[PDB]
Design a binder for this molecule. Structure first.
Ligand code: MG
Ligand code: MG
Ligand code: MG
Lengths: 313, 360, 184, 63, 78, 141
RNA sequence: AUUGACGGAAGGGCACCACC
C-alpha cells in the first residue's frame, strides 16, 4: 500500500541530469546539475499544469556540471564540473563568490561538511583534496590514494569519528580519518568500478554501487560488511532516505528501493512505455534525491527530464 | 416499404442549376466566445496533449426544435438544417451510405434526421486507395475509429478557444437548444437562420454553425469554425508522418488527407461554406504513439478561407446545388408520406424509400 | 499581425492551387516585415521552398550583372510595384503576386532525349520558372523605355494574375505548353 | 477538345533518368480515381508528397 | 565522408579487447577512458576512436561482433 | 543598483555591443535614436525585436548599442542580434527564467538569427582566379 | 604463355579544368 506514483516531470534542461540536491530549510526549491553546463534552481509550484518551473539558472562552468550540493543554511551552493574547478554560488544573487582552481582534471564529485566549515572534492586525477570556505587548497592526499579515478566522496554527518568516505574506479571503498587525513579502513569487496557512495543519515551505515550491478552495505563503526543487494543494471546513483529505513538506487532505467529490515524490494519504479519500436534503450536514471520530509523522490534522467515520485499510503 | 427514386453518381456528376443569389438573413442566435492565438500557434516539436471537454449535444430535427418550429410553418416551403444538404452535395464523392428523411407533406419539403443502418457520425478513410481492413473489434474498426474521431472533434472544438473567459452574447437566445437549464457548459456554438433562392419556392430556411469567433488583429467580430482530423498507423492507406512533416510539408499532408478522406472533407466544406464564416480552422491531431488510441496530441492548426478551400477540394458549388435541385425534383412527385434516403452501401448509388405508415 | 512593408496584410491571401500550396510561402509563419533576411536557403536541398515568396521575387531581380548584389534597390522596386498594384487593381498585392505565380507557371515541359519528348513539371520547378519568367518579362519591358521597373513589374504581374496574353510570362508559358503538347 | 487535367500525388521517387540525368521517375496516385498508380517522368526537383498537375493523363512513362 | 579508417577501427578494437570492463554506451566517459589508457597524439583521432568505441559497445550488447574476442565468450554457457 | 548587462551580436565582421541597464524605455544606437539609423529601407529589421516583444518588455530598461566593423547591412544585423540577446540576458539574470523562456521562444520562432550568430565569413582568394572559386579564362589554340 | 601499350571493341565508375 506504500508504493509510489509519478506526480509529474520537470522539463527545461538540455542535457543529462547528473545530480539533484535539496535542503531541509527550503522545501519549495531543489537544485539540478546537468550537462548543458548550467545548474537550475527550481520553484515547486505544485499545480496541474507543471509541478515545477525553472526559477533561476547558473551559468558558470565551461563543461558538464558533475555534482552539486546545498549548504546547511540553504544559501550557498557548491558545484563541481568537468572543467576542473569548483564554484561556491550565492543563491540569492545567482552569481558565484569563490572559484576553487586547484584540480588539474575533471572534478567528478563535491561534498560539504555538516557544519560547512571545510569541503572536499574528488576528481579524475586520482586525488582527493580538501578545501576551506575561503578558497585555498588545504591538504591534498596522495599517499595510499586510489590507483584510478575518484567518483564519489562524501562526509559523515555524525560527531563521533568524523570521517570521509570515498570510492573510485579501482573497485575500492576507502574510509579516511578527517582529523589527520590518514587512511583508516580499506574495503576491497566490489568487482567493478564504483559510481557512487552514500552514508546513512543516522551515521551508522554506508552504501556503495557501480558497474557490477550490486550494492554493498558497509558498517562505518568497525569496517565490516553487513550484506549485499543485487540490482538489475549499472548502479548510477544511490541515496538513503531520512525518515524511513530505505535505500534507493538507480539501476539502469528503473529505480529499486530496498528496505533495510526485511531486505526485500518494496517497489521498482519504472517509467512509462514510450518509443514502442524495440530499437533503442530507455533513458537511464542518473541521480536521486530525497526531500527532508521524505515524501518525495526526485530522479534525474537521460532524456533531460527530472521525474517526481510521490510516496502514497 | 416502397421503392420510389434511384439514381447513380454518374447522373449527379452532370446535374447543375446555378441559381444562387447573395443570401439574406432571417434571425441569428447564440452566444459566442473568443479564442487563444497561443493555442493556435502550437506547432510540431512543441506538443500539447488533448484533454476531454464536455460537449452539450445540440443535434435536433427542425420540427422538434422550437426556434425552427416557430418559423418553418410561417413562411418558406423548403427547409434543411446544417450539415444535411452535404449528403446530396457529396453523392459523387461518397462510397458509403447515409440516411436522411425528407417529408413531402403538402407543399412542405423539410429535411429531418433518420436512422436506417447508418448514422450521422464522422466517417474516416471511406474513399481511399487500399482501404483499412476494419475487421472485428480491432483498434481501427469502423464504429470505434468513428467514435474516436467524434471524440476528437467534440473535445478539441472546446479546447482551442478561450472557453473559460466571458462569452460574448448575441442579441437573440437559442431557444430549447440547451436552454431549459443553464448547465454552464453551453459552448460557443451559435446558429443562424438564412434564406436564399434556388428555384420553385426553394427559399431554403437553413440553420448554420459557428464554432466560435476570433478577435481580429485590429479588433472586430470574425466568426470561425473549429473542426479537426486524426492520424493513426501511417503505414495504412498510403499515409505520411505528421510529426516529421507538418512544419515544412503541410501541403502534402493536406493532399494525402484529401486523397484519403473526400466525402468527409466535402461534408465539412458544405457546412463551412453555407455558414458564411470567415476562417475555417483545421486542427491536426495525432496519437501519442502508433497502435495506441485513447491518447492524442494537437500538432497544429491551419487557417484557410472556406471558399478557397472549397476550390481546393475540386468541388463545384454549381453542380452541388444542381444535384440538390434535381433530388428535390425527384422528391417533388412524392406525397405526404416521408422518404428515408438510404443509399446503397456496397455499390455507391443514391436511393430513397417511401416510409410505410410513417416508418421511423 | 505582421504586415509586409508595414501595410500589406498576409492572412487573406489564397493559394487556390493545391499543388503549389507548400511552395508559395506567404502566411502564418512566413509573414515578415521585409523581403530581406540573411537566408542560408541554398545550403540544403528544398530549403528555398521555406523562403518568403517576396524575397524570392526580390532575389530574382538582382540580375544582368550591373544589378548583382544590389538588393536594397530590388526591395524598394518591389515595394513601389506593390503600391502601384494596389492602386491599379484594388486588391492586396500579395494575392495578385500569388495568382501571377499560379497562372504563369508551366505545367508540362519538353526535355531533350535524342526530337524532344514531353515531360511533367515539378511544383518547385514551376514556381522557379514562374518567378524567373515574371522577372525577365519586367526586366525586358523596362529596358530602353521611359517606363520604370516598378511600373513594368506591376503591369507584368497584373497581366499575369488576370491571365491575359499581353504579359510576357503567359506568352512563354503558352509557347512551352504548345511545344510540349505538339511533341508528346 | 482534349480531356480535362488531373492532379496526382507522388507516392515514391524511383530514381532519375534521361540522357544527361535531368528527369526523375516517380509513381503517382490520382486524386479522383483513387487507383491506377502510374509511373511518370517529372522535370525539376521532386520529393515524396508533391502534387503534380497532369496536363494529359492515361499515358504511361518510358518504362 | 564519415567513413572511419583502419587506424580508428583497429585502435578501437584493441581498446575494447583490453578494456571492455570500463566502457559503456556513453561517448564522453569513453573519450575520457581512451585518453587515460591510450597515447593518442591528437584530439580529433581521440574523438573518432571514442566514437567508434561507443558505436561498437552499442553492438556488443546485441551479439558478438566478428573481430572482437573478449571474456564474454565464457558466459555463453547455453 | 548595478543591474546592467553587456551583450554582443556579430554579423560577418561587424560587432555591436548592447549595454542594457535599468531605466525607462530608451533605445539608442551610437547616440542616435533607433529610427534614424541610415539604411532606412531596412528600418523594420531594426524594429523587429520591439515589434515582436512589444513595448512593455522594453519599458523598464535602457539600451545603448555601440556598433563597429563591417558594412551597413552587417551593422544593422549586428544591432538586431545585440538588442535581442541583451534583452534575453537581462531577463535571464534579473527577473525570472520563465519570462526569458517566453521571449526567447517568440524571437527564436520568428527568426533564429536574433539569438544565434551567422557563422559565414569571406573565403580566401586563390592564385588561379579573381576570387575564391572563380578562375581566369583558359584558352585553346 | 606473361607483363605493358593500343583497338574507328564490350561492360562499370569519376570530374562545373565534363555535361544537365
Ligand atoms: Mg526604364
Ligand atoms: Mg569577388
Ligand atoms: Mg551549359
Amino acid at each position: 500500500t506504500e508504493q509510489m506514483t509519478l506526480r509529474g516531470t520537470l522539463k527545461g534542461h538540455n542535457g543529462w541530469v547528473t545530480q539533484i540536491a535539496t535542503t531541509p530549510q527550503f522545501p519549495d526549491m531543489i537544485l539540478s546539475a546537468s550537462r548543458d553546463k548550467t545548474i537550475i534552481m527550481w520553484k515547486l509550484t505544485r499545480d496541474e499544469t507543471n509541478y515545477g518551473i525553472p526559477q533561476r539558472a547558473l551559468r558558470g562552468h565551461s563543461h558538464f556540471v558533475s555534482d552539486v550540493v546545498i549548504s546547511s543554511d540553504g544559501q550557498f551552493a557548491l558545484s563541481g564540473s568537468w572543467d576542473g574547478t569548483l564554484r561556491l554560488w550565492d543563491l540569492t544573487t545567482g552569481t558565484t563568490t569563490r572559484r576553487f582552481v586547484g584540480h588539474t582534471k575533471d572534478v567528478l564529485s563535491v561534498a560539504f561538511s555538516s557544519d560547512n566549515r571545510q569541503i572536499v572534492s574528488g576528481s579524475r586525477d586520482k586525488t582527493i583534496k580538501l578545501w576551506n570556505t575561503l578558497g585555498v587548497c588545504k591538504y591534498t592526499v596522495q599517499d595510499e590514494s586510489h590507483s584510478e579515478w575518484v567518483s564519489c566522496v562524501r562526509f559523515s554527518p555524525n560527531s563521533s569519528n568524523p570521517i570521509i568516505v570515498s570510492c573510485g574506479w579501482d573497485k575500492l571503498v576507502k574510509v579516511w580519518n578527517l582529523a589527520n587525513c590518514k587512511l583508516k579502513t580499506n574495503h576491497i569487496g566490489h568487482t567493478g568500478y564504483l559510481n557512487t557512495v552514500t552514508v546513512s543519515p543516522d551515521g551508522s551505515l554506508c552504501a556503495s554501487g557501480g558497474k557490477d550491478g550490486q550494492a554493498m552495505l558497509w558498517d562505518l563503526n568497525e569496517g565490516k560488511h553487513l550484506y549485499t543487494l543485487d540490482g538489475g543494471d549499472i548502479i548510477n546513483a544511490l541515496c538513503f532516505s531520512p525518515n524511513r529505513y530505505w535505500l534507493c538506487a538507480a539501476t539502469g532505467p528503473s529505480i529499486k528501493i530496498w528496505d533495510l529490515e526485511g531486505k526485500i524490494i518494496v517497489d521498482e519504479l519504472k517509467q512509462e512505455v514510450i518509443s514502442t519500436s524495440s530499437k533503442a534503450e530507455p533513458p537511464q536514471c542518473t541521480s536521486l534525491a530525497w526531500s527532508a520530509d521524505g515524501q518525495t523522490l526526485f530522479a534525474g534522467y537521460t532524456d533531460n527530464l527530472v521525474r517526481v515520485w510521490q510516496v502514497t499510503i | 416499404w416502397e421503392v420510389k427514386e434511384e439514381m447513380d453518381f454518374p447522373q449527379l456528376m452532370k446535374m447543375r442549376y446555378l441559381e444562387v443569389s447573395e443570401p439574406q438573413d432571417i434571425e441569428c442566435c447564440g452566444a459566442l466566445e473568443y479564442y487563444d492565438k497561443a493555442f493556435d500557434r502550437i506547432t510540431t516539436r512543441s506538443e500539447k496533449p488533448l484533454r476531454s471537454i464536455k460537449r452539450i449535444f445540440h443535434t435536433v430535427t427542425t420540427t422538434d426544435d422550437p426556434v425552427i418550429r416557430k418559423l418553418a410553418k410561417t413562411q418558406g416551403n423548403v427547409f434543411a438544417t446544417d450539415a444535411i444538404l452535404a449528403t446530396l452535395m457529396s453523392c459523387t464523392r461518397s462510397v458509403y451510405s447515409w440516411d436522411i428523411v425528407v417529408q413531402r407533406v403538402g407543399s412542405k419539403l423539410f429535411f429531418d434526421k433518420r436512422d436506417n443502418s447508418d448514422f450521422d457520425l464522422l466517417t474516416v478513410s471511406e474513399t481511399a486507395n487500399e482501404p483499412p481492413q476494419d475487421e472485428g473489434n480491432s483498434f481501427n474498426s469502423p464504429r470505434n475509429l468513428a467514435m474516436e474521431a467524434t471524440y476528437i472533434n467534440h473535445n478539441f472544438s472546446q479546447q482551442c478557444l478561450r472557453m473559460g473567459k466571458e462569452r460574448y452574447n448575441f442579441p437573440n437566445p437559442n431557444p430549447f437548444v440547451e436552454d431549459d437549464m443553464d448547465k454552464n457548459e453551453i459552448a460557443s456554438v451559435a446558429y443562424r437562420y438564412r434564406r436564399w433562392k434556388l428555384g420553385d419556392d426553394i427559399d431554403l430556411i437553413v440553420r448554420c454553425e459557428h464554432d466560435g469567433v476570433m478577435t481580429g488583429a485590429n479588433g472586430e467580430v470574425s466568426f470561425i469554425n473549429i473542426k479537426t482530423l486524426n492520424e493513426w498507423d501511417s503505414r495504412h492507406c498510403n499515409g505520411v508522418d505528421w510529426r516529421q512533416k507538418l512544419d515544412s510539408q503541410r501541403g502534402a499532408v493536406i493532399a494525402t488527407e484529401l486523397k484519403n478522406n473526400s466525402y468527409k472533407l466535402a461534408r465539412w466544406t458544405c457546412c463551412a461554406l453555407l455558414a458564411g464564416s470567415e476562417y475555417l480552422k483545421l486542427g491536426y491531431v495525432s496519437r501519442y504513439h502508433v497502435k495506441d488510441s485513447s491518447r492524442h496530441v494537437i500538432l497544429g492548426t491551419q487557417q484557410f478561407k472556406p471558399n478557397e478551400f472549397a476550390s481546393q477540394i475540386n468541388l463545384s458549388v454549381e453542380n452541388a446545388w444542381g444535384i440538390l435541385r434535381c433530388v428535390i425534383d425527384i422528391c417533388m412527385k412524392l406525397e405526404e408520406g416521408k422518404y428515408l434516403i438510404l443509399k446503397d452501401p456496397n455499390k455507391q448509388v443514391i436511393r430513397v424509400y417511401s416510409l410505410p405508415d410513417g416508418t421511423f | 499581425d505582421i504586415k509586409l512593408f508595414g501595410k500589406w496584410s498576409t492572412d487573406d491571401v489564397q493559394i487556390n492551387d493545391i499543388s503549389l500550396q507548400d511552395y508559395i510561402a506567404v502566411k502564418e509563419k512566413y509573414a515578415k516585415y521585409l523581403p530581406h533576411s540573411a537566408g542560408r536557403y541554398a545550403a540544403k536541398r528544398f530549403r528555398k521552398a521555406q523562403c518568403p515568396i517576396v524575397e524570392r521575387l526580390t532575389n530574382s531581380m538582382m540580375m544582368h550583372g550591373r544589378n548583382n548584389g544590389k538588393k536594397l534597390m530590388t526591395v524598394r522596386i518591389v515595394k513601389h510595384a506593390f503600391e502601384i498594384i494596389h492602386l491599379l487593381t484594388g486588391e492586396n498585392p500579395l494575392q495578385v503576386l500569388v495568382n501571377a505565380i499560379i497562372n504563369s507557371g508551366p505545367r508540362e515541359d519538353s526535355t531533350r532525349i535524342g526530337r524532344r519528348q514531353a515531360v511533367d513539371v515539378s511544383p518547385l520547378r514551376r514556381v522557379n520558372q514562374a518567378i524567373w519568367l515574371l522577372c525577365t518579362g519586367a526586366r525586358e519591358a523596362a529596358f530602353r523605355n521611359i517606363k520604370t521597373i516598378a511600373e513594368c513589374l506591376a503591369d507584368e504581374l497584373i497581366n499575369a494574375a488576370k491571365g491575359s496574353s499581353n504579359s510576357y510570362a503567359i506568352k512563354k508559358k503558352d509557347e512551352l505548353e504548345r511545344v510540349a503538347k505538339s511533341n508528346r | 477538345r482534349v480531356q480535362p487535367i488531373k492532379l496526382a500525388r507522388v507516392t515514391k521517387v524511383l530514381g532519375r533518368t534521361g540522357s544527361q540525368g535531368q528527369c526523375t521517375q516517380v509513381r503517382v496516385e490520382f486524386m479522383d480515381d483513387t487507383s491506377r498508380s502510374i509511373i511518370r517522368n517529372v522535370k525539376g526537383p521532386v520529393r515524396e508528397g508533391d502534387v503534380l498537375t497532369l496536363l494529359e493523363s492515361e499515358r504511361e512513362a518510358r518504362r | 565522408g564519415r567513413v572511419r579508417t583502419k587506424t580508428v577501427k583497429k585502435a578501437a578494437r584493441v581498446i575494447i579487447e583490453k578494456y571492455y570492463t570500463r566502457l559503456g554506451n556513453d561517448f564522453h566517459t569513453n573519450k575520457r577512458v581512451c585518453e587515460e589508457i591510450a597515447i593518442i597524439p591528437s584530439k580529433k583521432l581521440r574523438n573518432k576512436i571514442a566514437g567508434y568505441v561507443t558505436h561498437l559497445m552499442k553492438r556488443i550488447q546485441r551479439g558478438p561482433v566478428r573481430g572482437i574476442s573478449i571474456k564474454l565468450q565464457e558466459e555463453e554457457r547455453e | 543598483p548595478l543591474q546592467s548587462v553587456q551583450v554582443f551580436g556579430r554579423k560577418k565582421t561587424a560587432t555591436a555591443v548592447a549595454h542594457c541597464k535599468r531605466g525607462n524605455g530608451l533605445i539608442k544606437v551610437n547616440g542616435r535614436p533607433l529610427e534614424m539609423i541610415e539604411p532606412r529601407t531596412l528600418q523594420y529589421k531594426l524594429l523587429e525585436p520591439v515589434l515582436l516583444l512589444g513595448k512593455e518588455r522594453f519599458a523598464g530598461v535602457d539600451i545603448r548599442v555601440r556598433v563597429k566593423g563591417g558594412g551597413h547591412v552587417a551593422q544593422i544585423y549586428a544591432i538586431r542580434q545585440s538588442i535581442s540577446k541583451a534583452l534575453v540576458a537581462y531577463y535571464q539574470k534579473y527577473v525570472d527564467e520563465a519570462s526569458k523562456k517566453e521571449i526567447k521562444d517568440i524571437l527564436i520562432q520568428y527568426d533564429r538569427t536574433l539569438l544565434v550568430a551567422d557563422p559565414r565569413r569571406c573565403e580566401s582568394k586563390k592564385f588561379g582566379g579573381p576570387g575564391a572559386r572563380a578562375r581566369y579564362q583558359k584558352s585553346y589554340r
